[PDB]
Amino acid sequence: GKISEKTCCPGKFDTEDKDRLLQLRQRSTLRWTDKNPCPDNAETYCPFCELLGRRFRIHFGNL
């Protein structure tokens, strides 16, 4: 859990509503550095949460 010099938070993989989300995970997410992804209204984030997306941060277009 060390990209270049910063640590990485375990990320959040649990929403509240389930009307969207055509499918859910059944995979047993890989674990490292037991901590908490606490801040929901933050100002800085762990690089994994900058890859997740918490208008768009990183946008993937169609191929």
Next chain:
RNA sequence: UUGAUGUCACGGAACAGGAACUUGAACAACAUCGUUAC
């Protein structure tokens, strides 16, 4: 022609059963072709 905080589809052998088989001495003798004459 997708929408985002959540995709084990490399998560799944086009697989499993059905005799190209059955019947047959490489052997042998009587003709062929039509009209002539009162």
